[PDB]
Amino acid sequence: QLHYTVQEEQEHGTFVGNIAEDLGLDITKLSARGFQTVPNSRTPYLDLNLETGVLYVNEKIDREQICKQSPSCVLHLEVFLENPLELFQVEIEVLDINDNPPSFPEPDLTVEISESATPGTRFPLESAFDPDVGTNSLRDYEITPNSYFSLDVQTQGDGNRFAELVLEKPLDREQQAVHRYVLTAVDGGGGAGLPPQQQRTGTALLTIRVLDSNDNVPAFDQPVYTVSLPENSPPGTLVIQLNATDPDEGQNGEVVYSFSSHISPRARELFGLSPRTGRLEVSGELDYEESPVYQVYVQAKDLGPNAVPAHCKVLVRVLDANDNAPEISFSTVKEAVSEGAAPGTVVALFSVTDRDSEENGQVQCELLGDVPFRLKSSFKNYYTIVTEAPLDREAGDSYTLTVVARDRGEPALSTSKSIQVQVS
Numbered sequence: 053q054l055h056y057t058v059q060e061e062q063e064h065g066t067f068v069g070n071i072a073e074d075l076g077l078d079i080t081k082l083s084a085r086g087f088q089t090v091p092n093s094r095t096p097y098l099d100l101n102l103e104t105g106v107l108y109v110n111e112k113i114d115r116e117q118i119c120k121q122s123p124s125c126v127l128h129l130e131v132f133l134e135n136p137l138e139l140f141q142v143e144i145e146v147l148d149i150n151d152n153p154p155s156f157p158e159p160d161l162t163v164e165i166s167e168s169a170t171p172g173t174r175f176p177l178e179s180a181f182d183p184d185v186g187t188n189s190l191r192d193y194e195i196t197p198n199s200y201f202s203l204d205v206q207t208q209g210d211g212n213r214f215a216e217l218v219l220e221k222p223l224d225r226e227q228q229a230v231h232r233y234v235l236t237a238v239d240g241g242g243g244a245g246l247p248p249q250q251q252r253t254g255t256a257l258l259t260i261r262v263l264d265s266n267d268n269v270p271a272f273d274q275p276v277y278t279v280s281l282p283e284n285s286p287p288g289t290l291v292i293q294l295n296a297t298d299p300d301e302g303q304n305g306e307v308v309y310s311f312s313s314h315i316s317p318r319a320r321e322l323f324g325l326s327p328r329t330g331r332l333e334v335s336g337e338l339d340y341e342e343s344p345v346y347q348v349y350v351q352a353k354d355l356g357p358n359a360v361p362a363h364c365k366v367l368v369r370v371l372d373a374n375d376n377a378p379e380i381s382f383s384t385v386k387e388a389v390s391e392g393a394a395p396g397t398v399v400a401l402f403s404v405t406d407r408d409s410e411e412n413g414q415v416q417c418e419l420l421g422d423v424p425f426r427l428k429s430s431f432k433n434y435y436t437i438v439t440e441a442p443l444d445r446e447a448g449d450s451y452t453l454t455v456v457a458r459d460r461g462e463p464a465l466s467t468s469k470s471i472q473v474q475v476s
């Protein structure tokens with residue numbers, strides 16, 4: 053049983069083996085003996101010269117086609133002579149050359165990884181396939197140098213190899229949502245009398261899409277905000293536009309605002325908070341004389357799973373306006389004054405109050421008319437009405453004295469009160 057070898061991809065007419073010689077047959081007797089190829093073992097890849105006994109390549113041999121990824125490739129030829137009958141078997145071994153690169157099944161790979169994946173986690177890649185065999189097949193994978201991912205490769209047999217990405221450090225979608233790298237696969241070309249083989253290489257783009265986790269908590273730029281507003285500010289008045297930022301994606305990053313449970317029942321009445329905009333506004337009557345300040349406790353919380361609430365406090369200081377007029381109150385009024393009352397004779401006592409504060413609560417007083425009475429004051433806001441001259445029971449019998457109390461706000465407010473006095 054003769055044994056020959058032939059490189060795949062040799063051109064037509066290449067020498068394969070001298071069958072006549074290696075069997076001891078003189079070429080001069082070949083024709084007489086009916087030197088011929090057995091019918092079943094004919095192959096389009098081999099020509100046998102029957103006059104010389106020499107085997108030549110006929111059609112070029114592609115090992116990948118006849119033998120796929122088999123580790124061994126052997127064409128079986130059989131020849132025979134007649135008179136006597138003699139049958140000879142011939143095995144022709146086809147040697148693989150490195151005429152194919154590793155190849156990926158698609159030019160762009162995409163791998164999706166949660167930004168909360170732990171370092172050490174592995175993500176499989178689509179493997180490249182190299183149709184050559186043995187050392188000419190796939191040998192290793194490589195990735196663009198980078199600090200986030202390395203490669204792990206293992207043997208699958210039949211010259212195949214499988215790679216995974218190995219996560220080397222945490223990802224942060226909020227810092228970079230997509231990583232792009234170049235993936236490469238090289239075979240092992242670089243042995244039964246073969247000429248030098250060169251290494252071949254295949255390529256694929258690799259896209260890492262980083263999936264969002266709800267790992268950012270909404271954030272107010274301050275823990276307390278202070279706002280001053282005039283009392284009687286009308287409903288709808290803006291207090292403050294809160295903003296609790298959240299860089300996450302989707303519902304993870306959508307923030308809704310509401311009142312914390314610690315909020316006073318009065319603040320809940322007087323203020324209203326837009327759940328989606330964070331707009332805080334007045335919805336009731338702010339009355340300084342009721343309270344100069346309110347504490348609004350707000351919470352913000354995103355709409356994702358495992359959301360964590362954030363908190364801030366709005367201090368609403370109320371500013372006093374001049375919305376109360378002075379109050380006059382008489383404590384004693386002698387309706388009758390004697391005719392000859394000397395000047396300075398006291399006729400009435402009274403006091404004034406104003407529910408406002410500062411200038412808005414400061415009161416000045418005047419006596420109206422051209423009557424012969426004068427105002428005196430011993431202490432702030434306490435007054436007396438005295439006479440100023442002698443009198444007359446008939447010319448001036450009864451007198452109406454009216455006091456006007458005026459505060460010092462803008463616009464000012466004033467009040468009046470009258471008393472009836474008569475000469476005995």
Ligand SMILES: *[C@@H]1O[C@H](CO[C@@H]2O[C@@H](C)[C@@H](O)[C@@H](O)[C@@H]2O)[C@@H](O[C@@H]2O[C@H](CO)[C@@H](O)[C@H](O)[C@H]2NC(C)=O)[C@H](O)[C@H]1NC(C)=O
Binds near residue numbers: 293294295297
């Ligand atoms: C609420 O704030 C956002 C974001 O503001 C930026 O990021 C914060 C962390 C903080 O550092 C701010 O000072 C930053 O300006 C506002 O939206 C952004 O506004 C900036 C300019 O103000 C603009 O350049 C960006 O493109 C905006 N981006 C987005 C996604 O909106 C937003 O307008 C604020 N809302 C209100 C009601 O004030």
Ligand SMILES: *[C@H]1O[C@H](CO)[C@@H](O)[C@H](O)[C@@H]1O
Binds near residue numbers: 236252253254
């Ligand atoms: C294929 O190409 C790679 C580079 O992309 C080489 O490293 C390799 O030797 C082969 O030439």
Ligand SMILES: *[C@H]1O[C@H](CO)[C@@H](O)[C@H](O)[C@@H]1O
Binds near residue numbers: 234236253254256
């Ligand atoms: C695939 O394509 C890349 C281009 O980035 C080469 O480096 C590689 O050798 C193969 O040709």
Ligand SMILES: [Ca+2]
Binds near residue numbers: 113114115116117
């Ligand atoms: Ca081939």
Ligand SMILES: [Ca+2]
Binds near residue numbers: 151
């Ligand atoms: Ca080959």
Ligand SMILES: [Ca+2]
Binds near residue numbers: 151153182184188190
């Ligand atoms: Ca190859």
Ligand SMILES: [Ca+2]
Binds near residue numbers: 167224225227267
């Ligand atoms: Ca993150």
Ligand SMILES: [Ca+2]
Binds near residue numbers: 269270300
């Ligand atoms: Ca969030």
Ligand SMILES: [Ca+2]
Binds near residue numbers: 167226264266268300
């Ligand atoms: Ca996130």
Ligand SMILES: [Ca+2]
Binds near residue numbers: 338340341342
């Ligand atoms: Ca008031």
Ligand SMILES: [Ca+2]
Binds near residue numbers: 341
């Ligand atoms: Ca007031």
Ligand SMILES: [Ca+2]
Binds near residue numbers: 375
């Ligand atoms: Ca007042």
